[PDB]
Symmetry: D2
């Protein structure tokens, strides 16, 4: 409900997900940069019973960059927390791993942080 | 994509996957360290159509540290590549984020790296 | 000159550094959160001859959390780029490693991203 | 703190340090991979007064990928702990950031992990 919705990060990406009962996140992702074309499938997990304190709700999803238009041969996992409020945000960090040959395995991962607004 | 199987990272945590022909991962995860105990559910995505050159297959998945045995208010995202051959290893980096308050948001994410293989206790 | 100065991140930390001729960064750091008390020494490296394009200047320093008031037994390395301008910023990401016993080695590192303003 | 020595990560890059009694590291770094060639300078900080329990000594250092041989417009920060014993290993994670334009800022940082030891070619 708080999490279930449609979001947007600073890069302009579109994040449409449904916060499951089981603690499942399901939806689609449309990236605004990189070799992304249109929506991609997306799946993750969230804390069904977050702290009662003020803590945010932890979560994280995974976009495998393959659909009918492009296959960038690589997945991104966003790990972060949701914070409800007057400024409902979803703050995260993410990991861009690329299939590569062991000789490039070292420069295989790209790292960063996306902040979503609703 | 020998991906569907039972793997083991160096912490000896068990990871059990099944890769659908669509690009989805499902299954469980049982850590050997941390506020964990028993199986936690896992949901992921992976490249159903990987490059045919040498390139390894890419993948990712999440485990919300909550189940019937415990709730650690946190989640981990594994991101890396499945690399096949004689010994099959799936190489990843990970982000473990615990839910927190403003004052702590800053130190909410821990970062690490896990290597998984088909055998070892 | 562009880099040499005194900065501030979103957490309120104070970053005072001098951009060396050699490509050396030197100065002090005063953190606003964690177990930091007062200034700590700091040392790093920067790109002496950055791209002529529009690219930012890459850099990165290291604060070892020990001074006369506290020793949090841990170092932080910030890796990022400087971007001059009307909104001169220094965007980075950092790694908080803690001395620990191999049994906690796994949860040894803490990750994040600081954005500095001048 | 056997820290001052000659180490080697699994990529077989050479790292040469000297730890001052103040908490500073100095020396060079010679990668075996990437837009690197020859020695690049390195500046770091480390715990001069480490915990006496078991805890490993923490450390960090930076290498701006520029010298007389090449300029890759990027820098790497290694962060981790020196862990002594029979075989001495210094365990780190790293952030390699290349300078870029707005449109690319988003993919400027690569992340990885390196393990260093006193011997191996
Ligand atoms: O494989 C990629 C696919 C597209 C990347 C989307 C990323 S997910 C993190 C960030 N947040 C967003 O909303 N969008 C970006 N593209 C790609 C891969 C490699 C290179 N490269 O230069 O190596 C360039 C683009
Ligand atoms: O309760 C959690 C979950 C347990 C973490 C297991 C980690 S997942 C990365 C690595 N790979 C594995 O197979 N096992 C380990 N962790 C947690 C929660 C809060 C805090 N905290 O500091 O507040 C620290 C850790
Ligand atoms: O060892 C630490 C020392 C202080 C941390 C300063 C960090 S550097 C990244 C970030 N940017 C800032 O400007 N300040 C913070 N503190 C510490 C260590 C462990 C825990 N812990 O709960 O485990 C709490 C505080
Ligand atoms: O030119 C650079 C520097 C070479 C990187 C060596 C890395 S440091 C982490 C690891 N540990 C080592 O000992 N060696 C490797 N890299 C660079 C610059 C630009 C891009 N780019 O994609 O634009 C990629 C890599």
């Amino acid at each position: 409900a708080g999490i279930t919705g449609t979001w947007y990060n600073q890069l302009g990406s579109t994040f449409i997900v449904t916060a499951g009962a089981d603690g499942a996140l399901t939806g689609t992702y449309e990236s605004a940069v990189g070799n992304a074309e249109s929506r991609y499938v997306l799946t993750g997990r969230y804390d069904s019973a977050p702290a009662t304190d003020g803590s945010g709700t932890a979560l994280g999803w995974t976009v495998a960059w393959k659909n009918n238009y492009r296959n960038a041969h690589s997945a991104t996992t966003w790990s972060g927390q949701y914070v409800g409020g007057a400024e409902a945000r979803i703050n995260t960090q993410w990991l861009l791993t690329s299939g590569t040959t062991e000789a490039n395995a070292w420069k295989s991962t790209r790292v960063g942080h996306d902040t979503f607004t609703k």
